[PDB]
Amino acid sequence: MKLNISFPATGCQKLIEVDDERKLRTFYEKRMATEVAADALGEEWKGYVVRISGGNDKQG
Amino acid sequence: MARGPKKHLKRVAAPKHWMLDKLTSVFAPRPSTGPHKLRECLPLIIFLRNKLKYALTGDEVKKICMQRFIKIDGKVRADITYPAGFMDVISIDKTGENFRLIYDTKGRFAVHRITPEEAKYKLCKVRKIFVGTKGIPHLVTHDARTIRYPDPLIKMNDTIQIDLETGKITDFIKFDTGNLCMVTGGANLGRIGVITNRERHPGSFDVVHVKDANGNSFATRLSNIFVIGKGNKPWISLPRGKGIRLTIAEERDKRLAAKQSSG
Amino acid sequence: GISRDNWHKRRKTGGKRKPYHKKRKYELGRPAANTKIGPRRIHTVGVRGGNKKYRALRLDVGNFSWGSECCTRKTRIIDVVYNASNNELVRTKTLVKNCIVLIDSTPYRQWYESHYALPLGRKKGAKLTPEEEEILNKKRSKKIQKKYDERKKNAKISSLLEEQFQQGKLLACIASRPGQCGRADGYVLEGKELEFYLRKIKARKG
RNA sequence: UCGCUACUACCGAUUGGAUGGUUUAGUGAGGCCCUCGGAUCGGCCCGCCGGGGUCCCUGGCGGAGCGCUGA
RNA sequence: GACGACCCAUUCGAACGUCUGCCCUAUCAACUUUCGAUGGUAGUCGCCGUGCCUACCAUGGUGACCACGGGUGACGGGGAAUCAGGGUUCGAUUCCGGAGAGGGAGCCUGAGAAACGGCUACCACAUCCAAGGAAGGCAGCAGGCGCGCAAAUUACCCACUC
RNA sequence: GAAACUGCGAAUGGCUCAUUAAAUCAGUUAUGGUUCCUUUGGUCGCUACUUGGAUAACUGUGGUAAUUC
Ligand SMILES: [Mg+2]
Ligand SMILES: [Mg+2]
Ligand SMILES: [Mg+2]
Ligand SMILES: [Mg+2]
Ligand SMILES: [Mg+2]
Ligand SMILES: [Mg+2]
Ligand SMILES: [Mg+2]
Ligand SMILES: [Mg+2]
Ligand SMILES: [Mg+2]
Ligand SMILES: [Mg+2]
Ligand SMILES: [Mg+2]
Ligand SMILES: [Mg+2]
Ligand SMILES: [Mg+2]
Ligand SMILES: [Mg+2]
Ligand SMILES: [Mg+2]
Ligand SMILES: [Mg+2]
Ligand SMILES: [Mg+2]
Ligand SMILES: [Mg+2]
Ligand SMILES: [Mg+2]
Ligand SMILES: [Mg+2]
Ligand SMILES: [Mg+2]
Ligand SMILES: [Mg+2]
Ligand SMILES: [Mg+2]
Ligand SMILES: [Mg+2]
Ligand SMILES: [Mg+2]
Ligand SMILES: [Mg+2]
Ligand SMILES: [Mg+2]
Ligand SMILES: [Mg+2]
Ligand SMILES: [Mg+2]
Ligand SMILES: [Mg+2]
Ligand SMILES: [Mg+2]
Ligand SMILES: [Mg+2]
Ligand SMILES: [Mg+2]
Ligand SMILES: [Mg+2]
Ligand SMILES: [Mg+2]
Ligand SMILES: [Mg+2]
Ligand SMILES: [Mg+2]
Ligand SMILES: [Mg+2]
Ligand SMILES: [Mg+2]
Ligand SMILES: [Mg+2]
Ligand SMILES: [Mg+2]
Ligand SMILES: [Mg+2]
Ligand SMILES: [Mg+2]
Ligand SMILES: [Mg+2]
Ligand SMILES: [Mg+2]
Ligand SMILES: [Mg+2]
Ligand SMILES: [Mg+2]
Ligand SMILES: [Mg+2]
Ligand SMILES: [Mg+2]
Numbered sequence: 001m002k003l004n005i006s007f008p009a010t011g012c013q014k015l016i017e018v019d020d021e022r023k024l025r026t027f028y029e030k031r032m033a034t035e036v037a038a039d040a041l042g043e044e045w046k047g048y049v050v051r052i053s054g055g056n057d058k059q060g
Numbered sequence: 061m062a063r064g065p066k067k068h069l070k071r072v073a074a075p076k077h078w079m080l081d082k083l084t085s086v087f088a089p090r091p092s093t094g095p096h097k098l099r100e101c102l103p104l105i106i107f108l109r110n111k112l113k114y115a116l117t118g119d120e121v122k123k124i125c126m127q128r129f130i131k132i133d134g135k136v137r138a139d140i141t142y143p144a145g146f147m148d149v150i151s152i153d154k155t156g157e158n159f160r161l162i163y164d165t166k167g168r169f170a171v172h173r174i175t176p177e178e179a180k181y182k183l184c185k186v187r188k189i190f191v192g193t194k195g196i197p198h199l200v201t202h203d204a205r206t207i208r209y210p211d212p213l214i215k216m217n218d219t220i221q222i223d224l225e226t227g228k229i230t231d232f233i234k235f236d237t238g239n240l241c242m243v244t245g246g247a248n249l250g251r252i253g254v255i256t257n258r259e260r261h262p263g264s265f266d267v268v269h270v271k272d273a274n275g276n277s278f279a280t281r282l283s284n285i286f287v288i289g290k291g292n293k294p295w296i297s298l299p300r301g302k303g304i305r306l307t308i309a310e311e312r313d314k315r316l317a318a319k320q321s322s323g
Numbered sequence: 324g325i326s327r328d329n330w331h332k333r334r335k336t337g338g339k340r341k342p343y344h345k346k347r348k349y350e351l352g353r354p355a356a357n358t359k360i361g362p363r364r365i366h367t368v369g370v371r372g373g374n375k376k377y378r379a380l381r382l383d384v385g386n387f388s389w390g391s392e393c394c395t396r397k398t399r400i401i402d403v404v405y406n407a408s409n410n411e412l413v414r415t416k417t418l419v420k421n422c423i424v425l426i427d428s429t430p431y432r433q434w435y436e437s438h439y440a441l442p443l444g445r446k447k448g449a450k451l452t453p454e455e456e457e458i459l460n461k462k463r464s465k466k467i468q469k470k471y472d473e474r475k476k477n478a479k480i481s482s483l484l485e486e487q488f489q490q491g492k493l494l495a496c497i498a499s500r501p502g503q504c505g506r507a508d509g510y511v512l513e514g515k516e517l518e519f520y521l522r523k524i525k526a527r528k529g
Numbered sequence: 530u531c532g533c534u535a536c537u538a539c540c541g542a543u544u545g546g547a548u549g550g551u552u553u554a555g556u557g558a559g560g561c562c563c564u565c566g567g568a569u570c571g572g573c574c575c576g577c578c579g580g581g582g583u584c585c586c587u588g589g590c591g592g593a594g595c596g597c598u599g600a
Numbered sequence: 601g602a603c604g605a606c607c608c609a610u611u612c613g614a615a616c617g618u619c620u621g622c623c624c625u626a627u628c629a630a631c632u633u634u635c636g637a638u639g640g641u642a643g644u645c646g647c648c649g650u651g652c653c654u655a656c657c658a659u660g661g662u663g664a665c666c667a668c669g670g671g672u673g674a675c676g677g678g679g680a681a682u683c684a685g686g687g688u689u690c691g692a693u694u695c696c697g698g699a700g701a702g703g704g705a706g707c708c709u710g711a712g713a714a715a716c717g718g719c720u721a722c723c724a725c726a727u728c729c730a731a732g733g734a735a736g737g738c739a740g741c742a743g744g745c746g747c748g749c750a751a752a753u754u755a756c757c758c759a760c761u762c
Numbered sequence: 763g764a765a766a767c768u769g770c771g772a773a774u775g776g777c778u779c780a781u782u783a784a785a786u787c788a789g790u791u792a793u794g795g796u797u798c799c800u801u802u803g804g805u806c807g808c809u810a811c812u813u814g815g816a817u818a819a820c821u822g823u824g825g826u827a828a829u830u831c
């Protein structure tokens with residue numbers, strides 16, 4: 001699964017793609033409107049916390 | 061289906077006194093909702109192209125009416141299917157002519173030009189009387205008008221002469237035995253004569269008699285009498301031949317003698 | 324839905340009729356309100372031609388009137404005792420028209436006292452002394468007989484009524500469909516209706 | 530009467546076949562009503578900053594009960 | 601002047617109700633009822649009258665003047681063909697009334713719908729697929745298959761009536 | 763002045779005759795037992811020099827083979 005990251009501050013976004021499910025466990029078994037740290041996303045996100053805002057399914 | 065109100069009117073089913081042809085096309089103008097009943101009205105479109113010949117097709121009526129030329133009781137009507145009716149006074153300023161809708165004696169409307177010092181008042185027939193809130197007495201005429209504070213002697217079936225810039229009734233004729241009357245329903249349509257009688261069958265359609273200027277008498281229903289004069293003296297002007305309803309054996313003779321086959 | 328059509332049921336002769344059309348909307352049914360007692364819960368429904376219509380569930384207060392004295396006061400509703408059509412509405416305390424209820428009767432006491440300067444159903448003379456006697460006896464001398472003798476020869480509350488205030492609960496009859504006006508109003512029992520319903524309650528239950 | 534050839538309907542082992550409608554008993558999708566439920570989103574109550582005035586009122590950032598209240 | 605708005609009237613209606621009026625059948629003579637059938641009292645519900653529906657009570661209502669059941673290649677009427685006088689047969693069909701959008705059912709929105717050129721579900725059909733899913737209703741106008749003795753072009757245009 | 767929010771209309775019109783025999787329908791009457799968009803006429807007096815937050819079109823990133831998603 002890919003991600004659609006957004007930054008409401010300056011108004012920009014980027015569709016990133018990951019495959020190592022290791023960096024995906026931060027989301028699994030969670031709901032919408034919850035917040036979570038992106039520390040497991042990579043070295044570039046350290047003090048980064050982001051809110052899950054929904055998405056699409058397989059089949060859309 | 062019918063689940064709501066209809067809005068078209070078929071040419072055959074239209075009223076007869078509109079004197080419409082048969083082979084133009086399937087529909088007829090279908091007068092819009094107004095103060096006059098659907099069978100008793102005459103839409104403005106039928107008055108300008110079938111009678112006065114001013115226009116030729118529906119669009120010409122629409123672009124005559126849009127320029128704000130036509131006035132129905134002082135006000136300026138822009139709806140071409142507006143339901144004009146008995147005692148309404150069309151005024152065409154740009155020409156300087158006026159008309160009064162009155163039944164001709166064959167039982168249909170006809171053009172009847174009136175003097176502009178007359179087209180300032182119209183008659184109405186009283187339909188209801190009631191005391192509103194706080195004790196104010198009201199009035200309802202045949203064309204839906206509501207007059208507040210009328211004189212406390214005007215009652216049902218009477219006639220009242222109003223003005224077109226104020227309402228505010230001026231004179232009133234009282235329904236009783238001896239006054240003039242014009243008849244506005246059924247077989248005797250457009251006849252005139254003194255009332256001369258009224259029988260009263262309680263709970264059903266009281267009957268009224270009349271008597272022409274030639275002895276001819278003809279009953280009617282009371283809900284079809286319309287007083288237009290104090291007695292033998294009609295207030296409003298009258299069409300030629302004055303509701304006398306001559307028989308066909310007389311209509312033939314006048315046609316032959318006048319030999320009205322040309323001009 | 325549910326419907327109030329005539330055509331679903333058979334004619335004088337006992338013969339069936341075959342269905343004439345699908346159920347129309349103007350034959351509409353909708354379910355019962357079943358007003359209980361409790362804190363207010365009024366819903367609304369849209370009926371033919373706009374025209375809000377307030378359905379009432381869980382009512383508590385009623386604008387009851389006292390015909391002889393021309394009084395009428397918003398009063399708490401205590402209970403239902405007798406239902407003249409079906410009895411299992413008093414077992415479940417549903418509050419419909421021409422029910423029979425017990426109300427609180429306090430504001431009528433207050434009005435009667437303050438108007439006639441007299442006591443209604445009391446127990447003793449100890450509780451009336453610390454307060455509320457400052458209202459029964461006054462500064463007044465002019466007024467205090469100039470009008471309060473006009474209030475004498477008239478304070479003759481009936482025995483059947485007077486016996487009720489000693490408990491503070493009055494028998495009343497609903498005169499409004501709660502399920503269509505949201506309100507539960509009515510009047511308080513007088514005269515011979517009182518004897519009727521006293522007999523009926525004592526007869527059936529208990 | 531018996532015998533020939535054509536045609537028409539009848540009874541009938543099969544307890545014929547199909548089709549459609551009735552109907553007791555049992556299950557019963559979906560909407561409406563009611564009694565609950567409460568994902569989630571707000572506002573007012575405590576700091577720092579900017580405006581007024583004598584610490585309060587506004588606007589914003591953050592956090593403590595998130596207390597209460599609304600949908 | 602345009603717009604909006606409470607209530608009253610008026611208009612276009614709509615809804616319910618009164619009297620009289622129907623083709624064939626006795627190889628249909630008794631029917632109707634706690635699964636409301638006729639009536640009374642009080643309510644529920646509904647836009648209002650009403651067994652319309654619930655609770656208690658009474659035992660009623662219809663029939664040889666044809667009830668009730670069955671059949672109709674039965675949608676009703678204005679009308680059509682023939683016709684000395686009387687009649688017989690026809691009326692799917694351009695005007696008026698009713699009913700229905702494959703069959704049954706439920707509802708949203710609205711002044712107005714139990715609406716299908718609206719939505720939801722079952723029944724019967726049928727289309728697309730990456731087999732996860734999605735989509736449908738010509739008894740509107742043309743057109744096609746089928747059915748049958750039996751019925752026209754997948755044209756043009758809002759100029760006329762509205 | 764495209765688009766888009768808002769209002770209105772889409773319940774008329776057209777097509778067919780399966781159902782349906784006191785039903786539908788016709789003439790006759792009644793709503794004093796009801797509702798009524800619209801039109802027509804009445805009715806309009808027990809921070810104010812003007813309040814609140816939040817959406818579409820538009821910009822930008824998207825998912826499914828597929829749809830007026
Ligand atoms: Mg139609
Ligand atoms: Mg329909
Ligand atoms: Mg019109
Ligand atoms: Mg309304
Ligand atoms: Mg043989
Ligand atoms: Mg044989
Ligand atoms: Mg046989
Ligand atoms: Mg069988
Ligand atoms: Mg079965
Ligand atoms: Mg069941
Ligand atoms: Mg369910
Ligand atoms: Mg259910
Ligand atoms: Mg609740
Ligand atoms: Mg709650
Ligand atoms: Mg009864
Ligand atoms: Mg009743
Ligand atoms: Mg019997
Ligand atoms: Mg008998
Ligand atoms: Mg029968
Ligand atoms: Mg026939
Ligand atoms: Mg048939
Ligand atoms: Mg003949
Ligand atoms: Mg016909
Ligand atoms: Mg046929
Ligand atoms: Mg045809
Ligand atoms: Mg028709
Ligand atoms: Mg009719
Ligand atoms: Mg078909
Ligand atoms: Mg609407
Ligand atoms: Mg439908
Ligand atoms: Mg349609
Ligand atoms: Mg659809
Ligand atoms: Mg579907
Ligand atoms: Mg279609
Ligand atoms: Mg076709
Ligand atoms: Mg062939
Ligand atoms: Mg042929
Ligand atoms: Mg063929
Ligand atoms: Mg045109
Ligand atoms: Mg729009
Ligand atoms: Mg609309
Ligand atoms: Mg049917
Ligand atoms: Mg029958
Ligand atoms: Mg039958
Ligand atoms: Mg009848
Ligand atoms: Mg009729
Ligand atoms: Mg009738
Ligand atoms: Mg409009
Ligand atoms: Mg107005």
